[PDB]
Scaffold this active site. Structure first.
Site, PDB file in Angstrom:
ATOM      1  N   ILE A 283       0.824  -1.204   0.000  1.00 18.50           N
ATOM      2  CA  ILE A 283       0.000   0.000   0.000  1.00 18.50           C
ATOM      3  C   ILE A 283       0.864   1.262   0.000  1.00 18.50           C
ATOM      4  O   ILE A 283       0.439   2.304  -0.508  1.00 18.50           O
ATOM      5  CB  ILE A 283      -1.000  -0.036   1.175  1.00 18.50           C
ATOM      6  CG1 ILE A 283      -2.143   0.962   0.957  1.00 18.50           C
ATOM      7  CG2 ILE A 283      -0.318   0.189   2.525  1.00 18.50           C
ATOM      8  CD1 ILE A 283      -3.092   0.576  -0.153  1.00 18.50           C
ATOM      9  N   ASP A 284       2.093   1.184   0.503  1.00 15.88           N
ATOM     10  CA  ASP A 284       2.953   2.349   0.651  1.00 15.88           C
ATOM     11  C   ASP A 284       4.393   1.876   0.809  1.00 15.88           C
ATOM     12  O   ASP A 284       4.631   0.694   1.089  1.00 15.88           O
ATOM     13  CB  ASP A 284       2.497   3.234   1.839  1.00 15.88           C
ATOM     14  CG  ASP A 284       2.559   2.535   3.207  1.00 15.88           C
ATOM     15  OD1 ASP A 284       2.901   1.338   3.331  1.00 15.88           O
ATOM     16  OD2 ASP A 284       2.259   3.227   4.201  1.00 15.88           O
ATOM     17  N   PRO A 285       5.375   2.758   0.622  1.00 14.30           N
ATOM     18  CA  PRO A 285       6.745   2.418   1.016  1.00 14.30           C
ATOM     19  C   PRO A 285       6.886   2.351   2.531  1.00 14.30           C
ATOM     20  O   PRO A 285       5.974   2.674   3.295  1.00 14.30           O
ATOM     21  CB  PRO A 285       7.585   3.557   0.432  1.00 14.30           C
ATOM     22  CG  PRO A 285       6.766   4.103  -0.668  1.00 14.30           C
ATOM     23  CD  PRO A 285       5.348   3.963  -0.227  1.00 14.30           C
TER      24      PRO A 285
END
EC number: 3.2.2.27
Lengths: 69, 218, 437, 1006, 57, 65, 57
Positions: free
Chosen positions: B67-69
Site C-alpha cells: 500500500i505504501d513504502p
DNA sequence: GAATTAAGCAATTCGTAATCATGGTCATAGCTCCCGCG
DNA sequence: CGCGGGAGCTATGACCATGATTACGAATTGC
C-alpha cells in the site's frame, strides 16, 4: 456383391450405366418429339403414368444421396 | 528508456516503452498533486518515486502490491532493504524460505525476481506515517495499477484492510490476491501460503511458475 | 464500522484454498479425461475461483470432447521401420474404448457419459488407483460383458507392473511381451501377424500399441484394408444372461464384428446393402463411419429391431430380450441360489449380510429396473409418460397416458414387458416389507 | 436516570469498547461505555471442555439445536431432524476466540449485546447509577447491562442536534479538484441542543478583492480572521479558506446526533478534510467519549458486491470513520438505496420530493405570482413547499420552465412567491425545485460579489435542502424504527441490507423459542420457480377491473404452511411417476393433512419429476413465529398510529409499521438467498408454491363468477387445495347487495400476490361497493386461516401492454366516482429509467387518446391505426426536422456497476472512458444520464449498427456541440415499437416500421 | 406398343440401378455425392423436358 | 442469298440434329431388342436401304472436286 | 406403328435437305464441302451401325 | 494489522453476436462438339 | 478412318455477402 476391395470401380460402372440409360431416355425423348412432329394421333395417358412412376423412382433415388452434412 | 518533463521537484520521470499509454495522465495528475506533496519530507527520495516505471511489464506476470513504502529509509523500490531492518521484507523472506527451504540468506529482494514487479500502491509516504499521501496518490495509483493489471496476470496485495477495495480500484477484472500484511499480528502472514497460491494461479493461466528462490540475496 | 472491512475479502490466501486450487489445477489437467461429475465439480470450482480471485485463467466448460489422443499419435497404415531399443507391445482391442480417470467413475470416449460398472471391477480399479497415485487414467475396452484393461497410460512408471497388479486384484489383462530389436526392422504385415499370434488372445484385437520404456506419447499402429462386403442378415448372439450383441453376416458367412448397438446404428447398416469394413488377417471389423442415408435415428433403430425381432430393445451398448420373468431373474441379479417363493428368498437375504445391505441401500424401483436389465433414462422416460393405480405399494393396474413415447421401439418393448416388471416390482416390495417392516 | 438512546458505536481498535450515545430529558448528552465481547454459544459439555476458562458465561437454559439440512429423500423412510436439547452458555470473550462446534456464530456481536442484555436500541431506559462508573464528564461505564438496562420507560421527546451542510467549490473544468481549486462556500444548518436552527454560510475571502471584501462587510456580512471571532448567528460570514476549513473542522468535531450532507462523504466532507490537510495540515479529529482514542476523518469506500451472475461489485457507499457517536449521514446513499429516480443528484431529488400545486392570482410580464395552499394540493404538501421555499431560490414550473424567485412570502398554511416566468394561460401548475438555470463554470469565471452572494444563497439552499429531505423522508423516525425493529445501532440501520437486519429479530426469536438452527453440510445451488404471473386475457379493457391483493401474501404463506427450515420434516423427491404415486399414497397415510402440509413443488433437479416438502404444524417454526411477530407488531404500530394525534408520534408509528412491513417482506427473500441466516430452499420454494396455489385458487373462484339475484355464485367449488378443511365449500354465496345486480366477473390478470378481476360494469361507485362485498365475502368464505385479501383499487380503462406492464387510473376503496382519477402506471415506459422523457410524454398522450377512443364508443381499429400512424409520422418528422425539444427530454439513464459477465462490455468501457477522460468520477451504483450522440453531418439513417458505441454520458457541464447531434432515430424506433405493440392490426404497423426504419418490428404475443 | 415396352425396360433397368445404388449409397463419399447428385439432377432435367413435351405436345 | 454462309450454317446445324435423331432411332431399337420382345424389321430395312441409296447419291453429288 | 412413321418423317426431312443441297450445289467451295463430306461419312457410319442392328436378328 | 455481507423469480425491451435462410458468384466437373494430323 | 487438342456450353457444389432468427446479457420494473 461378394467382396469389393475398392468400391470405386463399381461407382464408375454405375456412372457409365446411368449415362447409358440417360442416352436411352434422351433417345426416346427426341423420337417421341419426332412422332409428335409426324402428326399421328396418340393417347399418352399411360406415358404420363409411366413418367410419374419414373419421377417417383428418381426422387426415391435422390432423397438419400444428394445432401451431405 | 523514455523520459518526460515534470515541472516539480523530481523534474524527470524515466519510464519503459510499455509504460507509455499512462504517462500523459500520470504527468497530468502529478503536476497537480506534487506542489502539495513535496512540502512533506517523503520517506522515499522524490527522485526515487518512479524507479518501478523503469521495469518492463510484459516479462512480469505477477505483481506484489504494497500500500505504501516503508515509513523510514524508503529505498523507492518496494520491499527492498539493503539494511534488511524492515519487518515486512523479513516476513517475505521467512515465507519464501518456508517455500524453498533456503534458510541461509543475507537478505531478500522482490525486484530481482523474473516475472515479479514489486509495487507500492501509494508511491510515497511521509516519514513515520502510513497511508499519509493516499489522497495525493489515489488516482495515480488507480491508473498505474490498472496498467499493471492490464499487463500482468496475477495481482498479489499485501494488505487486507488496505486492499479491501481493490476490485473497485481496478476497472478490468484481474486475478487478485488480497493477502494478509506481513507485519500483521496473530501470525496470519505466517499461517497463509499465498506465494504457493501465486504459483498455482499462474499455472492455471498457462504461465511460467515463479522461481521464488531468485529473490534471495546471499 | 471499519471493524467489518470496507469490502471484506475471504480466507483465499489460506492453505485450504491452496489445496482447493491445486485440486482445480489437477482436474483441469485431466479435464478431457474426467467424467461429467468431475466436469461439474470443475465448473463449480471455477465459479469459486471467479468469486474469490475475481479472474481465473481457465474457464467454465459446457461440453468437453473426451479424447485421450493428446497422449497418442496419428495412426499409420503403411509398413515402417522402427528405432532400436526396448519395446513393450500391447494389443489394441476392438470394443468400445473407456477410460477410468482419477474421478473414480468410468468415463466413455466420445460422449463423456459415466458408465455403470460392476462392484468387483470398480473395487479392483479403486485398489489399482490407490496403490499407485501416478496413473492418470486406466484405458479399458467393453465388449461381450468383459471389462479388459487395454492400456494403463502413466507418466513415471511402465504399464507392465501396473498390469501385473491388475492381474492381482482380478482385472483381466492382455499378455504383455517385452521384445527388443537390434536393427531397423520393417514392421510389415508378417511381423504384425506373428506378434498378434504371440499375444495368443482369443479376444478381437484391431491394432497393436507399442510402448517405449522412457518416452511418452505412445503410438498405435494398424494394418487393415478397406473392404465393401455385401450383407445377408444381422443376427444376434448371447454374451450374457439376458443381453445380446449385434453380429452382421455376409453371403459367404464371414462374421463382421460390431462394436455395440450405437456403432451399428450410427453407421446405418441396412439389409442387402454394402458396409465399410476393416479387413484383417482373421477377423472382420466394421469401420467407425457415419451413414449417409436420409433415414433418421428412430427409424433406423425401428427397422433394425424389426429385422431382428419385435421382442428386442436397445439397452445401451447391447440388445436385450423380453419374456416371462419371475423369481429366477431377481435371483440371478441377486447372485444367490435359486428360489421358489418369497419366503425362502427373504430368509436367505437375512442370512446374507452383504446382500441385505445392498437391498437396504438400493431403492425398490432401481432394484426392479436392474432385475429386468432396463436402460436408465429410457425406462424413466417410459414411466414418466403413463399413469398407475397403486394399492399397498403394488401396481394393481397401469395404463399408458402418452402415445408419443411408443414410436421409439425400445420404449414399446419395455412397455410390453411392463407386466413382468410389475410382477417383479411387487415381489421386491414384498421383500422390502418382510425385511424392514 | 432517564435517557433515550441516540446511537450505538464501537471503539476503533486498542481495547474493544462499545459505547452508547444517549440523551436525557433536560438535553444533556450521556455516554455509556460497555465492554464489547465476542459472544459465542456452546453446549454444556463444550463449555466445560474449554481449556481456557471463559471471561463470562451466563446460563441460557435448555435450548434445542436443530440441524436444518435439506436432504432429499427418494422414499418416505425419512429420519427425524437432529434435535439436541442441551444446557447452553454465552461465552463472552474480550478477544476473538476460535471455538470448535460453537453454534449460532452467524449473528453479530452487537445483536448479542442487545438481545441477551434485554436492550432495545431505540428504547428509553431508567439507568441504575450504581452500575454506571463515571470515566469523565458525560461518559460512564456499565459492566452489568442486565440490571442497569432493566426499566423500559415509555418514549419521551428529545432535543436532537443536527448539522446539515453542503459546500461549493470553484471549478473552471467540469469538476473541481481538491489540490488546485479552493473552497468558495461552506453552508451549514446548525441545529443545536437548544433547538436554535442557525443557517449560516461561510464566504471565502481569498476569491474576493479587498474592496470587494469591504463592500461585503458594508452589505452586512461580517469578516473574521480566526476561530474565536466566528459567530454562528450571522448568516453570511467572510473568512480565508484556512479559517473556513478550521470552522468546518470545529463543526464536524462537535458531537452532533446527525451530521447530514447530500453527496458529502464522497465529495463535500472528503474535500473539506483533504483541503484541511492541504492548506494547514490539520485533521478532523474524532475523539472517543472516554477520550482514550482519537481518530482522524478518513472517508472509507464501502463497496457492496452483487450476489447474482459474476458476483461483481454493484454499489459503492462512502462513510465516515467517526467514533464520537455522530451519525454522519449521506442522503445521497440513502435515497440511492430507497427511491427509484432517474438521477440521484440534488436537483432531481428536490424536484421529485418538493412538488406542489400552485394556482395563479396575479400575472405579470415577467413576474408571475403563484399561490399554493390546502385547496390546490394535498394537506401538508404546500407547507412543505413553503418550508423549502424559505431558503429556496429557483422554482421549476411544469417540469420545463425554471424561474428565479424574486420575492417569497410564507403564509400560515401555504406559500406566496413571485417567479421570473413568462405569461402562461392555465391556472393550476406544478411547482417544484428542479434544475438551476445557471452555468456555474462561467459563473465562477467572472466571479464578483453578487455572484458570491447568489451562490451563497444556493449553498444555503442545498444545506437546508438536506434538512428538508431529512424531514421529507422521515429519516430520524425510520432510523429509530430500524433500530428497534432490526435491533441494530441507529448508525447501522440503512448501511446494512436484508441479512444483517433480519439477524436481530431472528436472534430475539431464537432466544424466546429456545431454538438453535445449524447447517452442518455445505449449501448447494438450485434455481426454482417464483410467483405465477398470468397472461392478460385482453390487451384492452373498456370495463372496470377489480384489484384483489393479498394482505402480505408470502408472510401469510409461511405462517399458514409452517414453512420454516426446522419444521421441514423432509423433502420427498421422485425420478419416476411410479415412485411419485407410491410416495403420494405414503404421504397421504404417513403424514396427516391437518398436522402436516404436503407442498407439491417443482423438481430441483432435471431428473426428478416431483418434489414434495412436508412441514410439521404441531409447533410453529422460526419463519412463522418471526413473521407472526412482524405482522402483529405492524398491526399494533398501525393501531397506535390510528390512536395518535401529534404529527411527531404519527411519524414515529408510521415509520415503525413501515419498517415492520419491510422486514416482513424481507423474510421471503432471505429464505431463497443461499448465504442468509434464514436460508431454506425447501421452505422458500414451498412458499412460492403455496402462494402460486393461492393465486390459482383465487383466480379460479373468480373466473366466471356471477353475482345474480343478490347472490354470488363462484364457478369452482370452494375447496381448500392443500387439505380437506372443515369450512363450507358451497360456491353459491349469499351477499348483502341489492337483487337487481346481474354482473359477470372475469379474472383477466394475476400478479405474484394480486388477482385482477374484470367486472362487466362500467359504473365506478357500483363497482367499488360490489368489490367491497366481494372482498368481505372472500375473506369470510373463500379464504381460510390467516389468508386475507385487501381490495386495493378499481382500474378504469386498464391498458395492459403485456405481463407486469400496465397503465390505468386508480379508483381505490376510499375513493369514489366523484374523486379525481389518479394515474397508476406499472412497468411501462413512464416508470422505465431507460426511456427518454420524450418517449414517456408521447406514449402518455397517445395512450390517453386511445383511452378517449375507448371511452367514446365502439369504433374500428383500422381507421384509428391509420390516424395514430399519421399523427405519429407528423410528430416524429417535426421532431427530427425542427429539433425544438431540448437535450433534457431526450436523455436516458443507467446504473453503473461491475456485475458483468463480459469484461469488454461497452457499458463498463463507457463509464471507464468517462472516468478516465472527464474529471467527474462515476462510482459503483451511481446513476448517470446518457444520450445517443452522432455527428450532425450524417443523414437520416434507417439501418442501425453499433448503437451502444453511440452512447455518451451527459452531465451538468455537458453541452451539445454544433457539429454533434442527438441520435433521434433509435428514440423514434423504441417509441414507434411501443405504439405498434398497443395497436391491433400487424399489417399496417409492419409497413410503417419498414417505411420509417427498414426493419421488422417485434410484436408481443399474448 | 413399342414405346410401352421401351418405357417398361427403362423402368426395370432403372429400378435395378436404384437397387444397386441403394446397396452402395450408405457409404458414398463427398465428391461422389457431388458428382452423382449432378448426374441425377441432369436425369431429372431430362424427365422434366419429357413431362413438358408430353404435356404440351 | 449472298456469300452462301447462312446456307452452309443451316446445312451444318440441321444434319447434327439428323444424326442425333438417327442415333436415337438406333438406340431405341437396341433398347426394344434388349426388351426380349419378338420384332420384325422388313419395312425398316426397306426404308434404311432407300435412304442409304439417297445419302450415297447425295455424297456423290456433294463432292468438291 | 410409330417407329416406321418416325423414320418416314426422317426420310421426308432428308428429302427436303437433299433437294435444298441440290439447289445450292451449283457452288459449294472446298472447306465446307469437305466438312459436309465428313458429316456424310458420319451419316453412313450411323446408317451402317443401324443396318447391322437390323440384320443381326 | 484484521475485522464479512450479499433478498427470490417473472417478465419485458433493446442491443450484440453467433447461426442460418436466401441469393449471387466463382471454380469445376461434365460433356459435347469442331478441328485437326497422322 | 481414328483419337487427341481445344474451345465453348451448362449445370452444380463450394464459398462469400446480405439480411432475418434466436440465444444471451444488461437494464429495469414488479410483487
Amino acid at each position: 456383391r461378394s467382396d469389393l476391395s475398392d468400391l470405386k470401380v463399381a461407382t464408375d460402372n454405375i456412372v457409365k450405366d446411368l449415362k447409358k440409360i440417360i442416352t436411352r431416355i434422351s433417345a426416346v425423348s427426341t423420337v417421341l418429339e419426332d412422332v409428335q412432329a409426324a402428326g399421328i394421333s396418340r393417347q399418352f395417358t399411360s406415358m404420363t403414368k409411366a413418367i410419374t412412376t419414373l419421377s417417383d423412382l428418381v426422387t426415391e433415388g435422390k432423397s438419400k444421396v444428394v445432401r451431405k452434412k | 528508456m523514455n523520459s518526460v518533463t515534470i515541472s516539480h521537484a523530481p523534474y524527470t520521470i524515466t519510464y519503459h516503452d510499455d509504460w507509455e499509454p499512462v504517462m500523459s495522465q500520470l504527468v497530468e495528475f502529478y503536476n497537480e498533486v506534487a506542489s502539495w506533496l513535496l512540502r512533506d519530507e517523503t520517506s522515499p527520495i522524490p527522485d526515487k518515486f518512479f524507479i518501478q516505471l523503469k521495469q518492463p511489464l510484459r516479462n512480469k506476470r505477477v505483481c506484489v502490491c504494497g500500500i505504501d513504502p516503508y515509513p523510514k529509509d524508503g529505498t523507492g523500490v518496494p520491499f527492498e532493504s539493503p539494511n534488511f531492518t524492515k519487518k515486512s521484507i523479513k516476513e517475505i523472506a521467512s515465507s519464501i524460505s518456508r517455500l524453498t527451504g533456503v534458510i541461509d540468506y543475507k537478505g531478500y529482494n522482490l525486484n530481482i525476481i523474473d516475472g515479479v514487479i514489486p509495487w507500492n500502491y501509494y508511491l510515497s509516504c511521509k516519514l513515520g506515517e502510513t497511508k499519509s499521501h493516499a489522497i495525493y496518490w489515489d488516482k495515480i495509483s488507480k491508473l498505474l495499477l490498472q496498467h499493471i493489471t492490464k499487463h500482468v496476470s496475477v495481482l498479489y496485495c499485501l494488505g487486507k484492510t488496505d486492499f479491501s477495495n481493490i476490485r473497485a480500484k481496478l476497472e478490468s477484472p484481474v486475478t487478485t490476491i488480497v493477502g494478509y500484511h506481513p507485519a500483521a499480528r496473530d501470525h496470519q502472514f505466517e499461517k497463509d501460503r499465498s506465494f504457493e497460491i501465486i504459483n498455482v494461479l499462474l499455472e492455471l493461466d498457462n504461465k511460467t511458475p515463479i522461481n521464488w528462490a531468485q529473490g534471495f540475496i546471499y | 464500522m471499519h471493524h467489518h472491512h470496507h469490502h471484506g475479502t475471504g480466507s483465499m490466501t489460506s492453505s485450504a484454498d491452496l489445496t482447493n486450487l491445486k485440486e482445480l489445477l489437477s482436474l483441469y489437467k485431466s479435464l478431457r479425461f474426467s467424467d461429467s461429475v468431475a466436469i461439474e465439480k470443475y465448473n463449480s470450482l471455477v465459479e469459486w475461483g471467479t468469486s474469490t480471485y475475481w479472474k481465473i485463467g481457465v474457464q467454465k466448460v459446457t461440453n468437453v470432447e473426451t479424447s485421450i489422443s493428446d497422449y497418442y499419435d496419428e495412426v499409420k497404415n503403411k509398413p515402417f521401420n522402427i528405432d532400436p531399443g526396448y519395446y513393450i507391445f500391447l494389443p489394441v482391442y476392438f470394443g468400445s474404448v473407456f477410460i477410468y480417470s482419477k474421478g473414480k467413475n468410468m468415463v466413455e470416449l466420445g460422449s463423456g457419459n459415466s458408465f455403470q460398472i460392476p462392484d468387483e471391477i470398480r473395487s479392483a480399479c479403486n485398489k489399482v488407483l490407490d496403490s499407485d497415485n501416478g496413473i492418470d487414467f486406466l484405458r479399458f475396452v467393453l465388449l461381450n460383458n468383459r471389462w479388459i484393461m487395454e492400456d494403463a497410460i502413466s507418466k513415471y512408471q511402465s504399464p507392465v507392473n501396473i498390469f501385473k497388479l491388475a492381474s492381482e486384484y482380478g482385472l483381466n489383462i492382455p499378455n504383455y511381451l517385452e521384445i527388443e530389436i537390434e536393427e531397423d526392422t520393417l514392421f510389415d504385415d508378417e511381423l504384425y501377424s506373428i506378434m498378434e499370434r504371440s499375444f495368443d488372445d482369443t479376444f478381437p484385437k484391431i491394432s497393436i500399441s507399442y510402448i517405449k520404456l522412457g518416452e511418452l506419447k505412445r503410438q498405435v499402429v494398424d494394418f487393415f484394408k478397406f473392404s465393401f462386403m455385401y450383407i445377408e442378415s444381422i443376427k444376434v448372439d448371447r454374451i450374457g444372461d439376458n443381453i445380446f450383441i449385434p453380429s452382421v453376416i455376409t453371403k459367404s458367412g464371414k462374421k463382421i464384428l460390431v462394436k455395440d448397438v450405437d456403432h451399428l446404428i450410427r453407421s446405418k447398416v441396412r439389409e442387402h446393402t454394402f458396409v465399410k469394413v476393416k479387413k484383417k488377417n482373421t477377423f472382420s471389423i466394421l469401420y467407425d463411419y457415419d451413414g449417409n442415408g436420409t433415414e433418421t435415428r428412430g427409424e433406423v433403430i425401428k427397422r433394425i429391431i424389426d429385422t431382428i425381432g419385435r421382442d428386442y430393445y436397445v439397452n445401451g451398448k447391447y440388445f436385450s430380450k423380453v419374456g416371462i420373468a419371475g423369481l429366477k431373474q431377481l435371483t440371478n441379479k441377486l447372485d444367490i441360489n435359486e428360489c421358489a417363493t418369497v419366503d425362502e428368498l427373504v430368509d436367505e437375504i437375512n442370512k446374507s449380510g452383504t446382500v441385505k445391505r445392498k437391498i437396504k441401500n438400493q431403492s425398490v424401483f432401481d432394484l426392479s429396473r436392474e432385475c429386468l436389465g432396463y436402460p436408465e433414462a429410457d425406462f424413466i422416460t417410459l414411466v414418466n409418460n403413463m399413469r398407475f393405480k397403486i394399492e399397498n405399494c403394488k401396481v394393481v393396474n397401469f395404463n399408458i397416458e402418452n402415445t408419443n413415447c411408443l414410436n421409439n421401439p425400445s420404449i414399446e418393448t419395455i412397455y410390453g414387458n411392463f407386466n413382468q416388471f410389475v410382477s417383479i416390482f411387487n415381489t421386491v416390495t414384498d421383500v422390502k416389507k418382510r425385511l424392514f417392516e | 436516570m432517564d435517557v433515550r438512546c441516540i446511537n450505538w458505536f464501537e471503539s476503533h481498535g486498542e481495547n474493544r469498547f462499545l459505547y452508547l450515545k444517549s440523551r436525557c430529558r433536560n438535553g444533556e448528552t450521556v455516554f455509556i461505555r460497555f465492554p464489547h465481547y465476542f459472544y459465542y454459544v456452546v453446549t454444556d459439555e463444550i463449555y466445560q471442555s474449554l481449556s481456557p476458562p471463559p471471561f463470562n458465561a451466563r446460563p441460557m437454559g435448555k435450548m434445542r439445536t436443530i440441524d436444518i439440512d435439506e436432504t432429499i429423500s427418494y422414499n418416505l423412510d425419512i429420519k427425524d431432524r437432529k434435535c439436541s436439547v442441551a444446557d447452553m452458555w454465552l461465552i463472552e470473550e474480550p478477544k476473538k476466540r476460535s471455538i470448535q462446534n460453537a453454534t449460532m456464530d452467524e449473528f453479530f456481536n452487537i445483536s448479542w449485546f442487545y438481545i441477551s442484555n434485554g436492550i432495545s436500541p431505540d428504547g428509553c431506559y431508567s439507568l441504575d447509577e450504581q452500575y454506571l462508573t463515571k470515566i469523565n464528564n458525560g461518559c460512564y461505564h456499565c459492566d452489568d447491562p442486565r440490571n442497569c438496562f432493566a426499566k423500559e420507560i415509555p418514549r419521551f421527546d428529545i432535543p436532537r442536534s443536527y448539522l446539515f451542510l453542503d459546500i461549493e467549490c470553484h471549478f473552471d473544468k467540469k469538476f473541481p479538484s481538491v489540490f488546485i481549486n479552493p473552497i468558495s462556500h461552506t453552508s451549514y444548518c446548525y441545529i443545536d441542543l437548544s433547538g436554535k436552527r442557525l443557517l449560516f454560510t461561510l464566504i471565502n475571502e481569498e476569491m474576493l478583492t479587498e474592496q470587494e471584501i469591504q463592500e461585503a462587510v458594508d452589505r452586512g456580512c461580517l469578516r473574521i480572521q480566526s476561530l474565536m471571532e466566528m459567530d454562528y448567528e450571522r448568516e453570511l460570514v467572510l473568512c480565508s479558506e484556512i479559517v473556513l476549513l478550521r470552522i468546518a473542522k470545529q463543526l464536524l468535531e462537535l458531537t452532533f446526533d446527525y451530521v447530514v450532507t447530500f453527496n458529502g462523504h464522497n465529495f463535500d466532507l472528503r474535500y473539506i478534510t483533504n483541503r484541511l490537510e492541504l492548506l494547514t495540515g490539520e485533521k478532523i479529529i474524532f475523539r472517543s467519549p472516554d477520550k482514550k482514542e482519537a481518530v482522524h476523518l478518513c472517508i472509507y469506500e464501502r463497496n457492496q458486491s452483487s450476489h447474482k451472475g459474476v458476483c461483481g461489485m454493484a454499489n459503492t457507499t462512502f462513510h465516515v470513520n467517526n467514533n464520537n457517536g455522530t451519525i454522519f449521514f449521506d442522503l445521497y446513499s440513502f435515497i440511492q438505496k430507497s427511491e427509484k429516480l432517474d438521477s440521484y443528484k440534488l436537483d432531481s431529488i428536490s424536484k421529485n420530493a418538493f412538488s406542489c400545486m400552485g394556482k395563479v392570482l396575479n400575472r405579470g410580464v415577467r413576474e408571475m405570482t403563484f399561490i399554493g395552499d390546502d385547496t390546490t394540493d394535498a394537506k401538508g404538501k404546500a407547507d412543505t413547499f413553503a418550508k423549502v421555499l424559505t431558503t429556496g431560490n429557483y422554482v421549476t414550473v411544469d417540469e420545463d420552465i425554471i424561474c428565479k424567485v424574486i420575492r417569497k412570502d410564507i403564509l400560515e398554511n401555504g406559500f406566496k412567491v413571485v417567479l421570473s416566468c413568462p405569461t402562461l394561460p392555465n391556472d393550476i401548475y406544478k411547482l417544484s425545485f428542479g434544475k438551476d438555470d445557471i452555468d456555474l463554470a462561467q459563473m465562477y469565471k467572472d466571479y464578483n460579489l453578487n455572484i458570491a452572494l447568489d451562490m451563497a444563497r444556493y449553498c444555503i439552499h442545498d444545506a437546508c435542502l438536506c434538512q428538508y429531505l431529512w424531514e421529507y423522508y422521515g429519516v430520524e423516525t425510520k432510523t429509530d424504527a430500524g433500530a428497534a425493529t432490526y435491533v441494530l445501532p441507529q448508525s447501522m440501520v440503512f448501511e446494512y441490507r436484508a441479512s444483517t437486519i433480519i439477524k436481530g429479530p431472528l436472534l430475539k426469536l431464537l432466544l424466546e423459542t429456545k431454538t438453535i438452527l445449524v447447517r452442518s453440510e455445505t449449501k448447494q445451488k438450485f434455481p426454482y420457480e417464483g410467483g405465477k404471473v398470468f397472461a392478460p386475457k385482453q390487451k384492452m379493457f373498456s370495463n372496470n377491473v377489480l384489484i384483489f391483493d393479498y394482505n402480505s401474501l408470502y408472510p401469510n404463506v409461511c405462517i399458514f404452511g409452517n414453512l420454516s427450515p426446522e419444521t421441514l420434516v423432509g423433502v420427498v423427491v421422485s425420478t419416476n411417476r411410479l415412485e411419485e404415486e407410491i410416495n403420494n399414497q405414503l404421504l397421504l397415510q404417513k403424514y396427516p393433512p391437518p398436522r402436516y402440509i404436503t407442498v407439491h413443488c417443482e423438481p430441483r433437479l432435471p431428473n426428478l419429476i416431483s418434489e414434495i416438502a412436508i412441514f410439521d404444524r404441531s409447533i410453529e417454526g422460526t419463519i412463522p413465529r418471526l413473521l407472526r411477530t412482524f405482522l402483529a407488531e405492524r398491526a399494533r404500530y398501525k393501531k397506535m398510529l390510528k390512536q395518535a394525534t401529534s404529527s411527531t408520534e404519527k411519524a414515529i408509528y408510521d415509520s415503525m409499521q413501515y419498517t415492520y412491513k419491510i422486514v416482513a417482506n424481507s423474510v421471503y427473500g432471505l429464505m431463497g438467498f443461499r448465504n442468509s441466516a434464514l436460508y431454506s430452499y425447501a421452505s422458500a420454494k414451498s412458499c412460492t408454491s403455496i402462494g402460486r396455489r393461492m393465486i390459482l385458487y383465487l383466480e379460479s373462484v373468480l373466473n366466471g363468477a356471477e353475482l345474480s339475484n343478490g347472490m354470488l355464485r363462484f364457478a369452482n367449488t370452494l375447496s381448500n387445495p392443500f387439505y380437506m378443511d372443515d369450512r363450507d365449500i358451497n360456491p353459491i354465496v349469499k351477499t348483502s347487495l341489492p337483487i337487481d345486480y346481474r354482473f359477470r366477473f372475469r379474472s383477466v390478470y394475476g400478479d405474484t400476490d394480486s388477482v385482477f378481476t374484470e367486472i362487466d360494469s362500467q359504473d365506478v361507485d357500483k363497482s367499488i361497493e360490489i368489490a367491497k362485498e366481494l372482498e368481505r365475502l372472500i375473506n369470510s368464505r373463500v379464504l381460510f386461516n390467516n389468508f386475507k385479501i385487501e381490495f386495493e383499487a378499481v382500474y378504469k380503462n386498464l391498458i395492459m401492454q403485456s405481463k407486469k406492464k400496465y397503465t390505468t387510473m386508480k379508483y381505490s376503496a376510499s375513493s369514489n366516482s366523484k374523486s379525481v382519477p389518479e394515474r397508476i402506471n406499472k412497468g411501462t415506459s413512464e416508470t422505465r429509467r431507460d426511456v427518454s422523457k420524450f418517449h414517456k410524454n408521447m406514449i402518455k398522450t397517445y395512450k390517453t387518446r386511445l383511452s378517449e377512443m375507448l371511452s367514446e364508443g365502439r369504433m374500428n381499429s383500422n381507421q384509428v391505426c391509420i390516424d395514430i400512424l399519421r399523427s405519429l409520422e407528423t410528430d416524429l418528422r417535426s421532431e427530427f426536422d425542427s429539433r425544438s425539444s431540448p437535450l433534457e427530454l431526450f436523455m436516458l439513464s443507467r446504473m453503473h456497476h461491475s456485475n458483468y459477465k463480459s469484461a469488454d462490455n461497452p457499458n463498463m468501457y463507457l463509464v471507464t472512458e468517462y472516468n478516465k477522460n472527464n474529471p467527474e468520477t462515476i462510482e459503483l451504483g451511481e446513476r448517470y444520464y446518457f444520450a445517443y450522440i452522432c455527428p450532425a453531418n450524417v443523414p437520416w439513417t434507417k439501418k442501425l449498427v453499433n448503437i451502444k458505441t453511440y452512447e455518451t454520458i451527459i452531465d451538468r457541464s455537458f453541452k451539445l456541440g454544433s457539429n454533434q447531434r442527438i441520435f433521434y432515430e433509435v428514440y423514434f424506433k423504441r417509441l414507434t415499437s411501443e405504439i405498434v405493440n398497443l395497436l391491433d392490426n400487424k399489417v399496417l404497423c409492419i409497413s410503417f416500421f419498414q417505411r420509417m426504419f427498414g426493419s421488422r418490428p417485434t410484436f408481443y404475443e399474448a
